[PDB]
Structure formats: structure tokens, C-alpha cells
Design a protein around this motif. Structure first.
Motif, PDB file in Angstrom:
ATOM      1  N   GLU A 139      -7.224   2.208   0.412  1.00 43.87           N
ATOM      2  CA  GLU A 139      -8.256   2.748   1.073  1.00 43.87           C
ATOM      3  C   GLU A 139      -9.131   3.711  -0.067  1.00 43.87           C
ATOM      4  O   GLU A 139     -10.526   4.171   0.459  1.00 43.87           O
ATOM      5  CB  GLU A 139      -8.249   3.042   2.307  1.00 43.87           C
ATOM      6  N   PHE A 194       0.866   5.435   1.865  1.00 43.11           N
ATOM      7  CA  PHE A 194       0.023   6.304   2.427  1.00 43.11           C
ATOM      8  C   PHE A 194       0.289   7.877   2.533  1.00 43.11           C
ATOM      9  O   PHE A 194       1.823   7.636   1.863  1.00 43.11           O
ATOM     10  CB  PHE A 194       0.263   6.338   3.884  1.00 43.11           C
ATOM     11  N   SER A 209      -5.030   6.764   2.751  1.00 43.13           N
ATOM     12  CA  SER A 209      -4.229   5.080   2.171  1.00 43.13           C
ATOM     13  C   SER A 209      -4.411   4.519   0.426  1.00 43.13           C
ATOM     14  O   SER A 209      -6.055   5.465   0.247  1.00 43.13           O
ATOM     15  CB  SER A 209      -4.666   3.779   2.864  1.00 43.13           C
ATOM     16  N   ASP A 238       0.669  -1.338  -0.486  1.00 44.43           N
ATOM     17  CA  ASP A 238      -0.085  -0.143  -0.107  1.00 44.43           C
ATOM     18  C   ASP A 238       0.830   0.723  -0.151  1.00 44.43           C
ATOM     19  O   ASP A 238       1.766   0.961   0.276  1.00 44.43           O
ATOM     20  CB  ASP A 238      -1.019   0.071   1.303  1.00 44.43           C
ATOM     21  N   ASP A 268       4.598   0.893   3.466  1.00 47.94           N
ATOM     22  CA  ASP A 268       3.996  -0.239   3.827  1.00 47.94           C
ATOM     23  C   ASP A 268       5.446  -0.857   4.286  1.00 47.94           C
ATOM     24  O   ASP A 268       5.654  -1.848   5.255  1.00 47.94           O
ATOM     25  CB  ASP A 268       2.732  -1.055   4.032  1.00 47.94           C
TER      26      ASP A 268
END
Lengths: 126, 272
Positions: free
Chosen positions: B17, B5, B14, B3, B95
Motif C-alpha cells: 500500500e 505489514f 502495508s 502482504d 497476513d
């Protein structure tokens, strides 16, 4: 000057009766060129076979690999030369007028003494 | 799983997300762009190099979008374009290396429409400062609480790293990949409160800063970037215009001319 022969030689010195020429050569040989040596110039396509006296050199460092520029029979026109000529003529004119201001003032100053002489003589005559 | 961010306008998002259809496949970074000016001397071999610099580099993230249908695909494309392309820089991290972030500007990206609902893309970001940095400053508890690995051991577990001191001689650890220099537009704040005429000596780098006036405990002397301030007032005329830089690793600091000294260092780490 007052005689005629000096005037004749001065007048001869005062004019140029030949075309004004300036020669520039890009030289890339091994033999160094000094400021005094006279070389022999041979260049058939431009019709040159003469002796040339060096008057200007623009040399590079011996390790710089660059060509050398050599001049003969005075230099090209250029503007900075013209500006220098104009500036020096301006300076000469400035000093001339500065001198002549004092000269004219003295001419005024030299007048008063003779005025006094005239007055004294007038009084004496009476 | 992977991922990306993004921290922007005070909020952390995110990528997987914010856009449910988007999924980050792989994250990578370009090498440091070492730039160097060379001068040639005729008659000699080789070149003479000037001072080296580090040009902005590229952080890349290859991902894919799997929309529900064609209108969803177009809507997601527009939403991604609106979200990514702001008028100001923002921070990003991943991550895989959560402890290090890059302050970046977005780069043009082209959607490769493979199907009516599937599109591959590679989002590239210009890191324009030429370096990465920690997620916070030295005084920030955020910095030493997620993760930070340096030649083997995690710095988030070391307990000997302090940045607020009460004595006159101490040691400051700069964990970055190179020295911190305010002259290079780096961020470095030094706050002192003491009594007397302060004088700071960085023996490791051999630097010195002196203030030529008496100081009192309630007066705070703050050196930020290339500017010293006393009670938020520029007082550079009464100093030696000294600049204090932190070298890699341990720097030995000596404070002289004052007593009851409280000194704090606030700066982020710099990574190549």
C-alpha cells in the motif's frame, strides 16, 4: 681465610673455563623417562655420541598424545630467572643494610661507655 | 495474495500500500540458528557441548516492483531505500500469520533490474533477538484478538486464560515456545498490590521472591526485568534478589504472607 691453598681452591671455584651449554630434546618414544636415569644420546648430524643426565622434564599426560621435553646440562637463559636473581640480591642487600644500621648505632653506643672511661680516668689523674 | 505489514515509529504501514508498484510474492523465514560450543577431551571420543544459544535469524520476502516508467522506477527505488533503512529496529508481520511479529533490522538488498520498469528483489530482515513474539503483551487485548494457533486450537477463543488474579494461589499460562526468563533480557512485568509481607512461590519452576518489609494496599510492588520497585523506587536491598521465570504451559503460583492480593502479569510470548 688466611692461607694460600684455600684461596687457590676458592679462585678455581670462582670462574668457569668452559662454554656454558644447555641441551633440549623433544622425545616421542614409548619408554618413559624418569628424573634419575642417564640415557645415551646419539645424533650424528649434530656430532653427539655421549651419556646425558636428565636435569629437566616437561611431560604431558599419557593420554595427551603430546611430545616430551627433556633438558640436560642446566637450562636456557630466560628472563624470569634473571628477575628472581635480581630480587634475591635486592633482599640480601636490604637485610645487609638493615643489619649494618644497627651495627653502626651500636658503634655509636659502644663509644659512650669508652668516653665515660676516659672521663673517669681523666678525673682520677687530676 | 500476500502482504507485509511494518510497524515503525508508532505507525503501521502495508508494503503493497505504501508503494503501489511493489507487490509481495512470497514470505519465508530461516530456521532457528542453534549455536553450541564444544570442548574436546584427549583420550575420549566425541565432544562435550556447552549451553546452547539461538543466533539472530533471517526473515525473507521475495517481491517485485512494476513501475510506470523509468523516472518512476528510480523514484520508487529511492523511496523504498529511504523507507526500509531506518536507524532503529521495527516490527514486521504477514497476513499468512498475522498473530506473530518479528522485531527486525533491515539487511542489504540488491534490485535485479530485469526491464526498464520491472525489478525483482528479496528483502531480508535480521531478527536479532533470536525469537519471534506475539503482537502484544499478555495484558494487551490486541494479543488475543487476531489469531494464535498452538498445537491445533486457536488461543484467541480460549476463555480460561487470565493474567489478573485476586486469590492467593492460581495458575498462569505461558503460551510461548520456551520459558520466559528476565535474566535472558526478556520482558516480564509483575504488579502486586496487597497488605503485609509478600512472598511469591512459583511451584512449577520452584522459584521464590520475598520482600522483607510491610506493604499497604496503595503501595504497588512492580518486578520488571531483574529489578523490583516499590512506588517506582528500587528497593532491591530489602529483598532476596529473587527472579521469577515462567515455564512453558501452566505455572502454579502461590502468594503467601499477604491478604487482599491483586496481582497482574504483563509479558509477551516467545516463539522459536
Amino acid at each position: 681465610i688466611t692461607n694460600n691453598d684455600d684461596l687457590l681452591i676458592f679462585a678455581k671455584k670462582q670462574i668457569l673455563d668452559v662454554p656454558e651449554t644447555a641441551l633440549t630434546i623433544a622425545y616421542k618414544g614409548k619408554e618413559p623417562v624418569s628424573e634419575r636415569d642417564v640415557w645415551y644420546f646419539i645424533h650424528e648430524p649434530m656430532g653427539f655420541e655421549t651419556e646425558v643426565k636428565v636435569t629437566k622434564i616437561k611431560s604431558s599426560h599419557p593420554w595427551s598424545k603430546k611430545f616430551q621435553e627433556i633438558g640436560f646440562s642446566n637450562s636456557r637463559r630466560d628472563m624470569v630467572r634473571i628477575q628472581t636473581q635480581i630480587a634475591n640480591q635486592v633482599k640480601k642487600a636490604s637485610v645487609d643494610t638493615n643489619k649494618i644500621n644497627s651495627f653502626s648505632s651500636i658503634a655509636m653506643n659502644a663509644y659512650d661507655s669508652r668516653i665515660l672511661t676516659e672521663v673517669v680516668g681523666v678525673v682520677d689523674g687530676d | 495474495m500476500s502482504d507485509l505489514f511494518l510497524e515503525l515509529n508508532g505507525k503501521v504501514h502495508s508494503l503493497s500500500e505504501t508503494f503501489p508498484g511493489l507487490s509481495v510474492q512470497e514470505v519465508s523465514r530461516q530456521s532457528p540458528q542453534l549455536s553450541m560450543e564444544t570442548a574436546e577431551i584427549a583420550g575420549t571420543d566425541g565432544v562435550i557441548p556447552g549451553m546452547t544459544q539461538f543466533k539472530p535469524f533471517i526473515f525473507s520476502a521475495k517481491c517485485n516492483l512494476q513501475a510506470l516508467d523509468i523516472p518512476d522506477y528510480h523514484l520508487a527505488v529511492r523511496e523504498i531505500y529511504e523507507f526500509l533503512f531506518q536507524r532503529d529496529s521495527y516490527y514486521i508481520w504477514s497476513d499468512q500469520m498475522p498473530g506473530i511479529r518479528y522485531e527486525v533490522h533491515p539487511k542489504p538488498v540488491d534490485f535485479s533490474r530485469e526491464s526498464d520498469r520491472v525489478g525483482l528483489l528479496t528483502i531480508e530482515f535480521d531478527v536479532f533477538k533470536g525469537y519471534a513474539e506475539s503482537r502484544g503483551t499478555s495484558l494487551d487485548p490486541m494479543t488475543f484478538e487476531v489469531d494464535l494457533w498452538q498445537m491445533g486450537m486457536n488461543l484467541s477463543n480460549r476463555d480460561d486464560l487470565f493474567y489478573v488474579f485476586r486469590e492467593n494461589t492460581f495458575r498462569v499460562y505461558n503460551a510461548g515456545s520456551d520459558r520466559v526468563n528476565p535474566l535472558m533480557r526478556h520482558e516480564l512485568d509483575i504488579a502486586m498490590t496487597a497488605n503485609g509481607t509478600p512472598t511469591i512461590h512459583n511451584l512449577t519452576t520452584g522459584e521464590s521472591f520475598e520482600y522483607r518489609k510491610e506493604l499497604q494496599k496503595t503501595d504497588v510492588l512492580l518486578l520488571n526485568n531483574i529489578y523490583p520497585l516499590v512506588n517506582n523506587r528500587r528497593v532491591g536491598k530489602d529483598t532476596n534478589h529473587g527472579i521469577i521465570t515462567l515455564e512453558k504451559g501452566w505455572n502454579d503460583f502461590e502468594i503467601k504472607g499477604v491478604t487482599d492480593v491483586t496481582i497482574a502479569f504483563n509479558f509477551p510470548f516467545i516463539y522459536r
